[PDB]
mmCIF file of N, CA and C and ligand atoms in Angstrom:
data_model
loop_
_atom_site.group_PDB
_atom_site.id
_atom_site.type_symbol
_atom_site.label_atom_id
_atom_site.label_comp_id
_atom_site.label_asym_id
_atom_site.label_seq_id
_atom_site.Cartn_x
_atom_site.Cartn_y
_atom_site.Cartn_z
ATOM 1 N N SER A 1 77.339 82.855 138.438
ATOM 2 C CA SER A 1 76.388 83.288 139.461
ATOM 3 C C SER A 1 76.220 82.184 140.503
ATOM 4 N N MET A 2 75.192 82.290 141.338
ATOM 5 C CA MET A 2 74.959 81.301 142.381
ATOM 6 C C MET A 2 74.859 79.880 141.822
ATOM 7 N N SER A 3 75.727 79.001 142.325
ATOM 8 C CA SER A 3 75.773 77.599 141.910
ATOM 9 C C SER A 3 76.097 77.443 140.420
ATOM 10 N N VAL A 4 76.752 78.447 139.854
ATOM 11 C CA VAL A 4 77.247 78.358 138.476
ATOM 12 C C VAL A 4 78.691 78.807 138.497
ATOM 13 N N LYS A 5 79.616 77.847 138.573
ATOM 14 C CA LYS A 5 81.039 78.158 138.723
ATOM 15 C C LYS A 5 81.769 78.166 137.390
ATOM 16 N N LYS A 6 82.383 79.305 137.110
ATOM 17 C CA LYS A 6 83.298 79.477 136.007
ATOM 18 C C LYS A 6 84.542 78.623 136.264
ATOM 19 N N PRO A 7 85.008 77.886 135.250
ATOM 20 C CA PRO A 7 86.291 77.200 135.409
ATOM 21 C C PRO A 7 87.378 78.240 135.640
ATOM 22 N N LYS A 8 88.190 78.070 136.674
ATOM 23 C CA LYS A 8 89.265 79.023 136.927
ATOM 24 C C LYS A 8 90.614 78.334 137.049
ATOM 25 N N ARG A 9 91.660 79.070 136.685
ATOM 26 C CA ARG A 9 93.008 78.527 136.628
ATOM 27 C C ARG A 9 93.488 77.975 137.970
ATOM 28 N N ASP A 10 94.447 77.062 137.893
ATOM 29 C CA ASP A 10 95.095 76.498 139.067
ATOM 30 C C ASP A 10 96.073 77.534 139.612
ATOM 31 N N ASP A 11 95.783 78.057 140.802
ATOM 32 C CA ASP A 11 96.600 79.122 141.380
ATOM 33 C C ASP A 11 97.506 78.615 142.504
ATOM 34 N N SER A 12 97.562 77.296 142.668
ATOM 35 C CA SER A 12 98.280 76.690 143.789
ATOM 36 C C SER A 12 99.790 76.940 143.750
ATOM 37 N N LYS A 13 100.320 77.228 142.564
ATOM 38 C CA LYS A 13 101.754 77.471 142.408
ATOM 39 C C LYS A 13 102.126 78.959 142.366
ATOM 40 N N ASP A 14 101.138 79.846 142.468
ATOM 41 C CA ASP A 14 101.373 81.276 142.251
ATOM 42 C C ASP A 14 102.386 81.881 143.210
ATOM 43 N N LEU A 15 102.348 81.486 144.480
ATOM 44 C CA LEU A 15 103.293 82.027 145.455
ATOM 45 C C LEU A 15 104.743 81.737 145.048
ATOM 46 N N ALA A 16 105.024 80.472 144.756
ATOM 47 C CA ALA A 16 106.334 80.037 144.286
ATOM 48 C C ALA A 16 106.741 80.732 142.989
ATOM 49 N N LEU A 17 105.803 80.851 142.058
ATOM 50 C CA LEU A 17 106.113 81.468 140.772
ATOM 51 C C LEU A 17 106.401 82.960 140.912
ATOM 52 N N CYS A 18 105.650 83.646 141.764
ATOM 53 C CA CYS A 18 105.915 85.069 141.989
ATOM 54 C C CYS A 18 107.246 85.289 142.709
ATOM 55 N N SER A 19 107.583 84.399 143.640
ATOM 56 C CA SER A 19 108.849 84.492 144.352
ATOM 57 C C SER A 19 110.018 84.299 143.387
ATOM 58 N N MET A 20 109.868 83.347 142.474
ATOM 59 C CA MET A 20 110.879 83.092 141.452
ATOM 60 C C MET A 20 111.092 84.346 140.597
ATOM 61 N N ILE A 21 109.999 84.961 140.157
ATOM 62 C CA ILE A 21 110.099 86.173 139.344
ATOM 63 C C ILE A 21 110.776 87.283 140.144
ATOM 64 N N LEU A 22 110.343 87.474 141.380
ATOM 65 C CA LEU A 22 110.936 88.512 142.214
ATOM 66 C C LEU A 22 112.442 88.285 142.413
ATOM 67 N N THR A 23 112.868 87.035 142.589
ATOM 68 C CA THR A 23 114.293 86.731 142.739
ATOM 69 C C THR A 23 115.103 87.170 141.522
ATOM 70 N N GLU A 24 114.567 86.891 140.344
ATOM 71 C CA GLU A 24 115.236 87.258 139.109
ATOM 72 C C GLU A 24 115.280 88.779 138.957
ATOM 73 N N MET A 25 114.224 89.452 139.398
ATOM 74 C CA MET A 25 114.222 90.908 139.444
ATOM 75 C C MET A 25 115.294 91.418 140.381
ATOM 76 N N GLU A 26 115.377 90.828 141.571
ATOM 77 C CA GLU A 26 116.341 91.270 142.576
ATOM 78 C C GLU A 26 117.785 91.105 142.126
ATOM 79 N N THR A 27 118.049 90.146 141.240
ATOM 80 C CA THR A 27 119.426 89.863 140.828
ATOM 81 C C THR A 27 119.794 90.466 139.469
ATOM 82 N N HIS A 28 118.833 91.120 138.831
ATOM 83 C CA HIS A 28 119.093 91.848 137.590
ATOM 84 C C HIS A 28 120.119 92.946 137.859
ATOM 85 N N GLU A 29 121.044 93.139 136.921
ATOM 86 C CA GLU A 29 122.085 94.160 137.042
ATOM 87 C C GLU A 29 121.518 95.559 137.314
ATOM 88 N N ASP A 30 120.375 95.874 136.713
ATOM 89 C CA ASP A 30 119.801 97.210 136.839
ATOM 90 C C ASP A 30 118.785 97.320 137.980
ATOM 91 N N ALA A 31 118.767 96.348 138.885
ATOM 92 C CA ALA A 31 117.793 96.368 139.984
ATOM 93 C C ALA A 31 118.175 97.360 141.090
ATOM 94 N N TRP A 32 119.427 97.840 141.079
ATOM 95 C CA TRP A 32 119.961 98.614 142.207
ATOM 96 C C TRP A 32 119.113 99.818 142.667
ATOM 97 N N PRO A 33 118.435 100.548 141.749
ATOM 98 C CA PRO A 33 117.648 101.666 142.301
ATOM 99 C C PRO A 33 116.423 101.234 143.103
ATOM 100 N N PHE A 34 116.061 99.956 142.993
ATOM 101 C CA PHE A 34 114.775 99.451 143.474
ATOM 102 C C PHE A 34 114.913 98.440 144.610
ATOM 103 N N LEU A 35 116.129 98.242 145.111
ATOM 104 C CA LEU A 35 116.360 97.178 146.090
ATOM 105 C C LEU A 35 115.905 97.582 147.490
ATOM 106 N N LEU A 36 115.884 98.888 147.756
ATOM 107 C CA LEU A 36 115.510 99.422 149.076
ATOM 108 C C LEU A 36 114.560 100.594 148.876
ATOM 109 N N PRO A 37 113.809 100.971 149.914
ATOM 110 C CA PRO A 37 112.925 102.129 149.728
ATOM 111 C C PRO A 37 113.701 103.411 149.429
ATOM 112 N N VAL A 38 113.110 104.284 148.629
ATOM 113 C CA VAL A 38 113.667 105.623 148.445
ATOM 114 C C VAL A 38 113.720 106.313 149.793
ATOM 115 N N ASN A 39 114.840 106.973 150.092
ATOM 116 C CA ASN A 39 114.986 107.634 151.382
ATOM 117 C C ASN A 39 114.185 108.934 151.407
ATOM 118 N N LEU A 40 113.050 108.898 152.099
ATOM 119 C CA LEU A 40 112.111 110.016 152.090
ATOM 120 C C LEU A 40 112.666 111.248 152.784
ATOM 121 N N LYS A 41 113.667 111.050 153.632
ATOM 122 C CA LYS A 41 114.249 112.169 154.357
ATOM 123 C C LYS A 41 115.346 112.858 153.552
ATOM 124 N N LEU A 42 116.004 112.111 152.673
ATOM 125 C CA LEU A 42 117.145 112.646 151.935
ATOM 126 C C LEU A 42 116.824 113.005 150.485
ATOM 127 N N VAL A 43 115.647 112.627 149.997
ATOM 128 C CA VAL A 43 115.304 112.943 148.613
ATOM 129 C C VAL A 43 114.159 113.957 148.552
ATOM 130 N N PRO A 44 114.499 115.232 148.312
ATOM 131 C CA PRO A 44 113.469 116.276 148.253
ATOM 132 C C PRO A 44 112.390 115.944 147.225
ATOM 133 N N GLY A 45 111.144 116.286 147.537
ATOM 134 C CA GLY A 45 110.035 116.077 146.626
ATOM 135 C C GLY A 45 109.385 114.708 146.675
ATOM 136 N N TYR A 46 110.155 113.676 147.010
ATOM 137 C CA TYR A 46 109.665 112.312 146.827
ATOM 138 C C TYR A 46 108.449 111.985 147.692
ATOM 139 N N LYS A 47 108.525 112.286 148.982
ATOM 140 C CA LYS A 47 107.418 111.978 149.881
ATOM 141 C C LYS A 47 106.111 112.672 149.471
ATOM 142 N N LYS A 48 106.195 113.935 149.054
ATOM 143 C CA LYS A 48 105.000 114.680 148.653
ATOM 144 C C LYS A 48 104.459 114.217 147.296
ATOM 145 N N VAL A 49 105.364 113.931 146.363
ATOM 146 C CA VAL A 49 104.975 113.639 144.989
ATOM 147 C C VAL A 49 104.527 112.183 144.801
ATOM 148 N N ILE A 50 105.257 111.249 145.405
ATOM 149 C CA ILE A 50 104.999 109.827 145.188
ATOM 150 C C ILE A 50 104.145 109.285 146.319
ATOM 151 N N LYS A 51 102.849 109.157 146.059
ATOM 152 C CA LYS A 51 101.881 108.884 147.112
ATOM 153 C C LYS A 51 102.009 107.475 147.687
ATOM 154 N N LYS A 52 102.391 106.512 146.850
ATOM 155 C CA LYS A 52 102.553 105.133 147.295
ATOM 156 C C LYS A 52 103.925 104.584 146.924
ATOM 157 N N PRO A 53 104.942 104.883 147.751
ATOM 158 C CA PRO A 53 106.288 104.346 147.520
ATOM 159 C C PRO A 53 106.289 102.825 147.531
ATOM 160 N N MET A 54 107.060 102.215 146.635
ATOM 161 C CA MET A 54 107.196 100.764 146.635
ATOM 162 C C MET A 54 108.586 100.390 146.120
ATOM 163 N N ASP A 55 109.102 99.255 146.582
ATOM 164 C CA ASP A 55 110.426 98.791 146.148
ATOM 165 C C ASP A 55 110.484 97.281 146.313
ATOM 166 N N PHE A 56 111.518 96.652 145.761
ATOM 167 C CA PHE A 56 111.604 95.196 145.789
ATOM 168 C C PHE A 56 111.675 94.614 147.201
ATOM 169 N N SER A 57 112.353 95.291 148.128
ATOM 170 C CA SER A 57 112.514 94.710 149.461
ATOM 171 C C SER A 57 111.173 94.720 150.194
ATOM 172 N N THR A 58 110.344 95.716 149.906
ATOM 173 C CA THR A 58 109.018 95.785 150.517
ATOM 174 C C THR A 58 108.089 94.730 149.904
ATOM 175 N N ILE A 59 108.198 94.533 148.595
ATOM 176 C CA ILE A 59 107.443 93.486 147.930
ATOM 177 C C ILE A 59 107.856 92.121 148.468
ATOM 178 N N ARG A 60 109.157 91.928 148.674
ATOM 179 C CA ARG A 60 109.662 90.653 149.196
ATOM 180 C C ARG A 60 109.102 90.388 150.590
ATOM 181 N N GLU A 61 109.070 91.418 151.421
ATOM 182 C CA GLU A 61 108.514 91.260 152.767
ATOM 183 C C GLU A 61 107.033 90.898 152.714
ATOM 184 N N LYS A 62 106.269 91.633 151.910
ATOM 185 C CA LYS A 62 104.840 91.353 151.752
ATOM 186 C C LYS A 62 104.595 89.940 151.193
ATOM 187 N N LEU A 63 105.416 89.518 150.231
ATOM 188 C CA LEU A 63 105.274 88.183 149.658
ATOM 189 C C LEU A 63 105.582 87.085 150.687
ATOM 190 N N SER A 64 106.565 87.313 151.559
ATOM 191 C CA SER A 64 106.963 86.311 152.550
ATOM 192 C C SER A 64 106.030 86.260 153.750
ATOM 193 N N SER A 65 105.125 87.226 153.837
ATOM 194 C CA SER A 65 104.285 87.347 155.020
ATOM 195 C C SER A 65 102.797 87.287 154.666
ATOM 196 N N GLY A 66 102.495 86.791 153.466
ATOM 197 C CA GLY A 66 101.124 86.539 153.062
ATOM 198 C C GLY A 66 100.272 87.783 152.888
ATOM 199 N N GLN A 67 100.879 88.874 152.438
ATOM 200 C CA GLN A 67 100.143 90.124 152.300
ATOM 201 C C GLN A 67 99.657 90.381 150.868
ATOM 202 N N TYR A 68 99.909 89.431 149.968
ATOM 203 C CA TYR A 68 99.306 89.449 148.630
ATOM 204 C C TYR A 68 98.198 88.405 148.524
ATOM 205 N N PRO A 69 96.947 88.871 148.415
ATOM 206 C CA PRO A 69 95.778 88.001 148.291
ATOM 207 C C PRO A 69 95.865 87.127 147.051
ATOM 208 N N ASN A 70 96.416 87.671 145.967
ATOM 209 C CA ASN A 70 96.517 86.931 144.719
ATOM 210 C C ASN A 70 97.647 87.455 143.850
ATOM 211 N N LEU A 71 97.859 86.798 142.715
ATOM 212 C CA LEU A 71 99.002 87.144 141.885
ATOM 213 C C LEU A 71 98.834 88.537 141.278
ATOM 214 N N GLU A 72 97.591 88.972 141.060
ATOM 215 C CA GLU A 72 97.361 90.295 140.466
ATOM 216 C C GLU A 72 97.771 91.430 141.411
ATOM 217 N N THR A 73 97.522 91.272 142.706
ATOM 218 C CA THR A 73 97.946 92.302 143.647
ATOM 219 C C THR A 73 99.482 92.382 143.716
ATOM 220 N N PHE A 74 100.157 91.257 143.499
ATOM 221 C CA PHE A 74 101.623 91.242 143.408
ATOM 222 C C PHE A 74 102.104 92.072 142.204
ATOM 223 N N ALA A 75 101.542 91.771 141.041
ATOM 224 C CA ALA A 75 101.919 92.470 139.810
ATOM 225 C C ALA A 75 101.672 93.974 139.943
ATOM 226 N N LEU A 76 100.590 94.343 140.620
ATOM 227 C CA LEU A 76 100.279 95.759 140.820
ATOM 228 C C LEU A 76 101.398 96.467 141.570
ATOM 229 N N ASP A 77 101.899 95.833 142.623
ATOM 230 C CA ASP A 77 103.007 96.400 143.386
ATOM 231 C C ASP A 77 104.296 96.448 142.566
ATOM 232 N N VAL A 78 104.568 95.428 141.752
ATOM 233 C CA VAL A 78 105.772 95.493 140.927
ATOM 234 C C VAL A 78 105.691 96.681 139.945
ATOM 235 N N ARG A 79 104.543 96.821 139.299
ATOM 236 C CA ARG A 79 104.331 97.900 138.335
ATOM 237 C C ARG A 79 104.343 99.263 139.007
ATOM 238 N N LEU A 80 103.907 99.316 140.260
ATOM 239 C CA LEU A 80 103.955 100.559 141.028
ATOM 240 C C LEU A 80 105.402 101.059 141.172
ATOM 241 N N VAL A 81 106.332 100.139 141.418
ATOM 242 C CA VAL A 81 107.751 100.493 141.471
ATOM 243 C C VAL A 81 108.168 101.259 140.219
ATOM 244 N N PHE A 82 107.795 100.738 139.055
ATOM 245 C CA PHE A 82 108.249 101.352 137.804
ATOM 246 C C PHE A 82 107.442 102.597 137.442
ATOM 247 N N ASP A 83 106.176 102.629 137.842
ATOM 248 C CA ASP A 83 105.362 103.815 137.598
ATOM 249 C C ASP A 83 105.887 104.979 138.432
ATOM 250 N N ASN A 84 106.230 104.692 139.684
ATOM 251 C CA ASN A 84 106.850 105.684 140.562
ATOM 252 C C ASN A 84 108.152 106.193 139.973
ATOM 253 N N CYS A 85 108.961 105.269 139.460
ATOM 254 C CA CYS A 85 110.259 105.610 138.885
ATOM 255 C C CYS A 85 110.090 106.557 137.705
ATOM 256 N N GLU A 86 109.100 106.274 136.873
ATOM 257 C CA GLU A 86 108.807 107.120 135.713
ATOM 258 C C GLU A 86 108.330 108.500 136.116
ATOM 259 N N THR A 87 107.530 108.555 137.171
ATOM 260 C CA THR A 87 106.999 109.829 137.630
ATOM 261 C C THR A 87 108.123 110.752 138.076
ATOM 262 N N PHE A 88 109.117 110.193 138.755
ATOM 263 C CA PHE A 88 110.133 111.001 139.420
ATOM 264 C C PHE A 88 111.427 111.186 138.620
ATOM 265 N N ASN A 89 111.692 110.283 137.691
ATOM 266 C CA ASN A 89 112.981 110.270 137.014
ATOM 267 C C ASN A 89 112.860 110.539 135.527
ATOM 268 N N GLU A 90 113.809 111.308 135.001
ATOM 269 C CA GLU A 90 113.918 111.508 133.569
ATOM 270 C C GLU A 90 114.202 110.181 132.882
ATOM 271 N N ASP A 91 113.565 109.964 131.735
ATOM 272 C CA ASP A 91 113.704 108.715 130.990
ATOM 273 C C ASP A 91 115.153 108.339 130.694
ATOM 274 N N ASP A 92 115.989 109.344 130.462
ATOM 275 C CA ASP A 92 117.348 109.043 130.039
ATOM 276 C C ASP A 92 118.349 109.053 131.195
ATOM 277 N N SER A 93 117.890 109.391 132.391
ATOM 278 C CA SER A 93 118.758 109.280 133.552
ATOM 279 C C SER A 93 119.055 107.797 133.780
ATOM 280 N N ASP A 94 120.045 107.493 134.612
ATOM 281 C CA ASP A 94 120.395 106.095 134.865
ATOM 282 C C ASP A 94 119.255 105.368 135.561
ATOM 283 N N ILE A 95 118.708 105.984 136.603
ATOM 284 C CA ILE A 95 117.588 105.381 137.306
ATOM 285 C C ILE A 95 116.380 105.254 136.381
ATOM 286 N N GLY A 96 116.117 106.305 135.602
ATOM 287 C CA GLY A 96 114.995 106.294 134.682
ATOM 288 C C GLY A 96 115.088 105.153 133.679
ATOM 289 N N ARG A 97 116.267 104.986 133.091
ATOM 290 C CA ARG A 97 116.477 103.922 132.111
ATOM 291 C C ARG A 97 116.464 102.544 132.773
ATOM 292 N N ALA A 98 116.955 102.461 134.009
ATOM 293 C CA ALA A 98 116.895 101.206 134.755
ATOM 294 C C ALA A 98 115.450 100.746 134.913
ATOM 295 N N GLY A 99 114.567 101.688 135.236
ATOM 296 C CA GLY A 99 113.152 101.399 135.409
ATOM 297 C C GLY A 99 112.480 100.877 134.144
ATOM 298 N N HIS A 100 112.736 101.530 133.017
ATOM 299 C CA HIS A 100 112.203 101.052 131.748
ATOM 300 C C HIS A 100 112.707 99.649 131.441
ATOM 301 N N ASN A 101 114.000 99.423 131.664
ATOM 302 C CA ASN A 101 114.594 98.112 131.435
ATOM 303 C C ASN A 101 113.926 97.048 132.306
ATOM 304 N N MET A 102 113.781 97.360 133.592
ATOM 305 C CA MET A 102 113.212 96.404 134.545
ATOM 306 C C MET A 102 111.734 96.131 134.296
ATOM 307 N N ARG A 103 110.980 97.146 133.866
ATOM 308 C CA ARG A 103 109.580 96.934 133.493
ATOM 309 C C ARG A 103 109.455 95.952 132.327
ATOM 310 N N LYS A 104 110.235 96.165 131.289
ATOM 311 C CA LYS A 104 110.253 95.221 130.188
ATOM 312 C C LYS A 104 110.612 93.822 130.629
ATOM 313 N N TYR A 105 111.625 93.715 131.454
ATOM 314 C CA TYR A 105 112.097 92.437 131.953
ATOM 315 C C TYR A 105 110.986 91.741 132.742
ATOM 316 N N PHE A 106 110.305 92.508 133.591
ATOM 317 C CA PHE A 106 109.216 91.962 134.389
ATOM 318 C C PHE A 106 108.056 91.485 133.526
ATOM 319 N N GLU A 107 107.607 92.337 132.601
ATOM 320 C CA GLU A 107 106.384 92.029 131.875
ATOM 321 C C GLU A 107 106.536 90.784 131.006
ATOM 322 N N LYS A 108 107.709 90.550 130.458
ATOM 323 C CA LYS A 108 107.899 89.334 129.674
ATOM 324 C C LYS A 108 107.877 88.143 130.605
ATOM 325 N N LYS A 109 108.514 88.241 131.759
ATOM 326 C CA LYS A 109 108.504 87.119 132.686
ATOM 327 C C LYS A 109 107.096 86.848 133.157
ATOM 328 N N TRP A 110 106.322 87.913 133.336
ATOM 329 C CA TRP A 110 104.942 87.777 133.789
ATOM 330 C C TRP A 110 104.136 87.023 132.748
ATOM 331 N N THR A 111 104.279 87.450 131.501
ATOM 332 C CA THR A 111 103.577 86.816 130.408
ATOM 333 C C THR A 111 103.969 85.350 130.242
ATOM 334 N N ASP A 112 105.273 85.082 130.227
ATOM 335 C CA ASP A 112 105.764 83.728 130.003
ATOM 336 C C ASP A 112 105.368 82.774 131.110
ATOM 337 N N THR A 113 105.303 83.295 132.330
ATOM 338 C CA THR A 113 105.029 82.460 133.491
ATOM 339 C C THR A 113 103.547 82.076 133.636
ATOM 340 N N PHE A 114 102.613 82.974 133.324
ATOM 341 C CA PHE A 114 101.252 82.800 133.844
ATOM 342 C C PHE A 114 100.094 82.529 132.886
ATOM 343 N N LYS A 115 100.214 82.973 131.642
ATOM 344 C CA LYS A 115 99.364 82.427 130.591
ATOM 345 C C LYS A 115 100.155 81.393 129.776
ATOM 346 N N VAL A 116 100.608 80.363 130.497
ATOM 347 C CA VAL A 116 101.145 79.097 129.962
ATOM 348 C C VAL A 116 100.772 78.796 128.513
HETATM 349 C C1 UO1 B 1 118.487 105.782 148.680
HETATM 350 C C2 UO1 B 1 117.577 106.292 147.581
HETATM 351 O O1 UO1 B 1 116.736 107.129 147.850
HETATM 352 N N1 UO1 B 1 117.696 105.799 146.223
HETATM 353 C C3 UO1 B 1 118.661 104.795 145.870
HETATM 354 C C4 UO1 B 1 119.826 105.146 145.195
HETATM 355 C C5 UO1 B 1 120.752 104.152 144.858
HETATM 356 O O2 UO1 B 1 121.942 104.496 144.179
HETATM 357 C C6 UO1 B 1 120.503 102.819 145.190
HETATM 358 C C7 UO1 B 1 119.329 102.470 145.860
HETATM 359 C C8 UO1 B 1 118.396 103.457 146.201
HETATM 360 C C9 UO1 B 1 117.122 103.075 146.932
HETATM 361 C C10 UO1 B 1 116.817 106.287 145.196
HETATM 362 C C11 UO1 B 1 115.915 105.520 144.464
HETATM 363 N N2 UO1 B 1 115.283 106.353 143.611
HETATM 364 C C12 UO1 B 1 114.256 105.944 142.690
HETATM 365 C C13 UO1 B 1 113.839 104.480 142.641
HETATM 366 O O3 UO1 B 1 113.706 106.749 141.961
HETATM 367 C C14 UO1 B 1 115.749 107.644 143.751
HETATM 368 C C15 UO1 B 1 115.406 108.857 143.082
HETATM 369 C C16 UO1 B 1 116.054 110.046 143.422
HETATM 370 C C17 UO1 B 1 117.041 110.048 144.422
HETATM 371 C C18 UO1 B 1 117.382 108.861 145.084
HETATM 372 C C19 UO1 B 1 116.723 107.647 144.737
#
């Protein structure tokens, strides 16, 4: 409360750490469905069904331009990519399985990186 400060983690390295994680995501073999935005003009259903499209290149732009207030808003956008993928794709399709793989890959990196 007022004049009572909770000890809080050192967040000075978060930008660098999130960029590192995003780089590893971008270079993962199964990253290909997520490297660019879904083409809203060529993919029927997507624009109407997926209310908040997100992809790695958009996250990279936002990260490079100071549009993430904190590390949690970054993680939200990464998870949005995979939540969108699950909504639109069958689990056993190539894109669907890529998304599950990439979510697992992300969440372990997230855990290993930030609760030291
Ligand atoms: C151009 C395009 O729309 N896609 C795409 C396809 C690729 O092979 C490589 C990269 C991308 C961005 C699609 C991504 N999709 C996802 C993530 O569900 C889709 C879901 C349905 C149809 C297309 C896509």
